[PDB]
DNA sequence: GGAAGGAGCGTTTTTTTTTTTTTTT
């Protein structure tokens, strides 16, 4: 298990918000975790190569949308997440993040 | 936790479960192989699973290697006498700067140096992936090159092959 | 005129339109009215050699689309093409999924141009069972834009699911009763002068195959033209060309069989095989001679019918003609 | 020099000396070769079928059809098993024997022949205006030995590209030819020469070679020993003439193929002894015969008729022998390894005799 | 939603597995002791091999199950590279476990493993046996190469008896509160042919269709095993009886000719009553009919002729 | 669009209510979906009995009109090797539903064409992801399915279509078209169908074509036989009577005349004669043995071609010799 | 001076289509 953490600065991570699954109410202290197969997640690498900005949006139904902006070429990638996270993976993720 | 076949493994050549005549033949052949100019360079043991091929080879090496190794001229890796009587090829080893098919080729290229004050018995039990056609062809080439080598000095090379049928697979 | 005379008569007189197809009206009517209904189903043509299956499908395709549109709406594959499972799963499927090409104004004006393509699998009985299985859902799914036509001589070689999917058309054998008009027309076109009943004899010899009959007529016409005597072709010449054994030789064989002496039969058969007669023709002639004879009893006829069937089945397996013929004659002599 | 089989081979239809009716039919075919159909010549081996085909081609094109050369064509299977085929060619025709490819013969039909059929042969006209077109002639030797798949592949190639190609197939028996292929062909029966015509040809060869012949009867005997195979007749005539200082006599032995003598010895052994050990020795002889690439079905024919030639055997024995021969011939046709069926035949004969 | 009963009622402890009482008891002894050796578990489908191995691993490893078990089956990559890297790294891992406890590598459907991977497994077993133990699960123990078998204890699971199947069915019925009759449970057990998975599936199907598990209701959905019908057809003393069975019970029920002939061969192989000559002749006739069917002539007439020949031989 | 389709496809059932003949299976599956407890399914049966139609209709009912978004359908026309099972099927079965619409459905049509290795790999995919996904396997030949796969599926047998269901579907088609079918024609169609709806629909379409004016012309048994080129029952009866009573010459002439009248093929005559003789009351059983063996041999020989006249004479002789036992 | 037990012998190896693994890429 390895981790890549994005800095909490307004230069790489412009903004982050957690909406409690309704897009409206902001909740602090709640962690949203999305589990994906790298075979599908890695398909956005080439789109990110030319990307200027990337907007991630995850819903409660297990759908992740990535909007990539490079007058210009615009890309939208939608992927489904896995059904559930195994106990070992959940424990390792919690240990890594805490 | 200990398995009995490991806990009660033979501690000497006499305790090895092997027919006397076969043991005598193997011992004579191996002893001849250790002589300065030995006619035979490779000893190929074949048989079914668990018939004491590797065990008898190791027990015999424990006696033969000390008796035929030249005393080091005050040179050795570590303080200990480097009890490495048997050098075995490891088929699952993967290194960064070597293609898989060449791994065995590298091993032999080192094994040739284990003579005289560095004498050691070369044992091949875990073979390379001979089910791959190219790997098998390269293995055969290397064996032939060892057999036809012009090197004046080489260490004894023992190949233990356990014969078994391959069940039909989908 | 030389260019028109560059083709054997079978290719020269291949039907151009569905009207030219003879003796197969039971299916030709359905195919013809499909031109107006535009409701063509998947088809399975099956029948013995030289009955007009390939000609019928080619005429239908020509009538439906026309010389130009056809090239974009037809995919033809036969035994001369590789037709493995991968081919069925890639090339046939891709063609079946292809969008229907846009017809030109001329095509629409002149031809019905139904909104689907056609995949013809000639000699379909040569395809493997797995390759055939790969066609099932391809035919079912893309039936809106694609229709399949399978053609074969041995229907049992088509797997049951495909036979169920396809509407079946049996092509009947062409004999002296239903195909005589076409052969007479061909003879009149080529100015072949033959004695009365010659065309009947050709059609009876051909045994359901009009292609063989047309080839025989061409050979007889060539012989007559080379002779250049101006005389009518005779049935004896036709029988000689067809390889039919002369009646006197058959009578000699029958007398030898009646005698029953093994050595004499062996000697006569050894001398008879010198001439190179085909054992199949001899067996057919012996069946005709014995089954229709009124001088033998019922048990004899039953036994000889089974013997003849066994010998013919063995010959169909590409067996060795001398041995089979001698065995058959020895068995008959023992009846 | 060349063997007498090829040295005195006729090179035109007018040079044919036996089966006059066949020559007349071939000449009638050559009258207007513009619409020549596909041909299938069938008859006993060594009678002159290939010679007649070459004479027909010479009549259509000219003597240049005899200026033959050889090329090697490479094919690759789906398993990457590279292999080669010999293609004989004259400026007007091609000759192939796909059966030499075994089960791969179909590939030859699917790749080579089709391509030849697809490439339309055109040439600049020497005097007239525009290109001139001419169909290609292709000879398929040993047609009866083709697999059913190759025969099926031949069908639409023969039909569709009839303008560019005309096939002339040659076989010794039509039993293995599938019905569609026969339907697509003009069948030509080629009878074997009679003993008198074989003797006449041999006498002409003898006179040309200046070999002293005591009596013509010898030639007749040679004919009777060839069983109508003219090629074999000429080969034995040459062998006997060379072995007797170019002087044949009534006492001069007739030289037969060695495997034929071996089969005769095997027949005598089978007749004399019928036991398990005899069967094992018969197996040894059969394997020796097979090691020389003698076809299994040919061995079965020759053994069967050699056995039927035995004088001591009675009618029941011969009837049983021919029954077993037919059964095991079918088994060989439908089988994979011929040794099983040859052994079964010999064992059944031993049982019936004993 | 609601899980199918086959997965809903999968035993979670070794004490809930029925049948093979001796083997299950030995597994319980191993679980309580700890000294688990390399083992191979062989048997027919749906008798509890996978459940037994999973339950034993859980009981042995307790909370350490997540970090102490490596499970791989035919649905995962299991080539030689996997043995070289993943299994090797797992076996090299140093995990602190209670005394007598080792890491477990579960190789379900081990029979399908490739020859190269199996040969590679020898060295890892030799090197890491002090900390890792291997549990193979398969249907044919002979499909594991002999050098691997030489290191493992063999355990063959037998077919479940009607008593064990009935006991488990009664437990499931009590949990689900299902209405039934003795004849219905008898029919379910008879149609299961010793497969507990099939018994549970058929019980669930019958309950969903009608709720009350009777004989008639069970037989409306479930069909009697066609091997028994084929055996009855083959053993009929009259040609007409065999033909009638073939027509009514097999042909008109939609059974394909190929299935009928394959089942006939399988059944004839196990006919204890018949003599050897008759048996081998019947096998020959079945093979000839199978050859005819494979060529495309899969007609009822061919099967009737096969039956006629078999009857002729019986006389 | 649907008007241009072949009838076998134009009349494909859309809802489960349109599937006839399989009352038990339809009842059970409908109740399962009503309770939402669908297990892994196996549909085993002969061609053209409604398996694919039933599974598609069930998917439509479960997911409404948007079933194509959460159903993964694969058939023999698609490659389904072990790699496909490991990657595509595995990823589909291991991912969430589009809108949390319960479980996902994977249809493996014609699964008897899948390799043993792929079927073996399917076992644990089916088992582990049962909570989120359900599998449906359709087949005509069970011997091609591994025992492990068969153990995992709830089995449903599609019987050959009964006469009543075929009659109801024929009535529906006749109403949809402007067609008139006679009772004798319906009986002939049912007899020749052998429980396959596809054959019924194809023959009906061909019969509609045969009619000169379908708006007013009625289909009779003669039209059915003309379209199928099949023998009439009277022809079979006459041939059998001549074989069993007339002498060899008369029987040969009768067979030749009957065949030449409408160009009948020998195989269909043999099949009809076998149907007739199956109901014959024979006092000697050896007669049945001879009949069955000889006629099966003749059918096998015909399957490879051969000489037609010799085969017909063989049929005559075989029947005569077999019935000499009853003497 | 009877077996009882044991070892050694009795051997060589492409091919149709189709699917799959492995290694280098
Ligand atoms: N008296 C003994 N004699 C031989 N091996 C013994 C003995 N006692 C315990 N063992 C163990 O049994 C095993 C013997 O098997 P092996 O020597 O490996 O036979 P093998 O011929 O090399 O078969 P493979 O190729 O390893 S499966 C060794 O692990 C030994 O430690
Ligand atoms: N019904 C027919 N009407 C007119 N000519 C026919 C007919 N059938 C065959 N022929 C003639 O014989 C030739 C071959 O006809 P085909 O349509 O190729 O027969 P076929 O049934 O396709 O033969 P197979 O099955 O490939 S052996 C045609 O070019 C025609 O000259
Ligand atoms: N002995 C058993 N006791 C209770 N339930 C069983 C038993 N055997 C099978 N089952 C039931 O059927 C389901 C499958 O059991 P499994 O252990 O997977 O059978 P299996 O022998 O491993 O089948 P294979 O070899 O993987 S096809 C379990 O979840 C149980 O619900
Ligand atoms: N029970 C049925 N009710 C109504 N029509 C049916 C029925 N079964 C088959 N058909 C008709 O025949 C056509 C084919 O039905 P299918 O469901 O595809 O048969 P099938 O059992 O799946 O055939 P196989 O096993 O794939 S060859 C349908 O479009 C329907 O028009
Ligand atoms: N003088 C003469 N020789 C012939 C004649 N026909 C064939 N031959 C010769 O006899 C041999 C016949 O063998 P071949 O042509 O291969 O016949 P095939 O095997 O049936 O094709 C050849 O060497 C010919 O040269 C003929 O009509 N006259
Ligand atoms: Mg060892
Ligand atoms: Mg054709
Ligand atoms: Mg399991
Ligand atoms: Mg279907």
Numbering used by the authors:
A (entry chain F): 202 to 271, 302 to 329
B (entry chain A): 63 to 232
C (entry chain D): 19 to 353
D (entry chain E): 1 to 354
E (entry chain B): 7 to 321
F (entry chain C): 9 to 335
From the manuscript:
Reprocessing of a recent data set of Rad24-RFC in complex with 9-1-1 and a 5’ ss/dsDNA junction yielded a 2.1 Å reconstruction of the open state that revealed that Rfc5 also binds GDP in the Rad24-RFC complex. In both structures, the specificity for Rfc5-binding guanine rather than adenine nucleotides is imparted by Rfc5-Arg52, which coordinates the C6 carbonyl and the N7 of the guanine base. Our observation that Rfc5 in both RFC and Rad24-RFC binds GDP instead of ADP was highly unexpected, as AAA+ proteins generally utilize ATP and ATP is sufficient to fuel clamp loading by both RFC and Rad24-RFC. In the case of Rfc5, future studies will be necessary to determine if Rfc5 is a functional GTPase or if GDP instead serves a structural role. The α4 loop of Rfc5 also undergoes a conformational change during the opening of the 9-1-1 checkpoint clamp. However, the conformations resolved in the presence of PCNA are distinct from those resolved in Rad24-RFC:9-1-1 as the α4 loop adopts a β-hairpin in the open Rad24-RFC:9-1-1 structure and is disordered in closed Rad24-RFC:9-1-1. Thus, flexibility within its α4 loop allows Rfc5 to bind to two distinct DNA clamps – PCNA and 9-1-1 – and stabilize them in their open states during loading. Consistent with this notion, we have recently found that the 5’ ss/dsDNA junction is exclusively coordinated by Rad24 in Rad24-RFC.
RFC is composed of four small AAA+ subunits, Rfc2-5, and one large AAA+ subunit, Rfc1, which assemble head-to-tail into a two-tiered partially open ring structure.
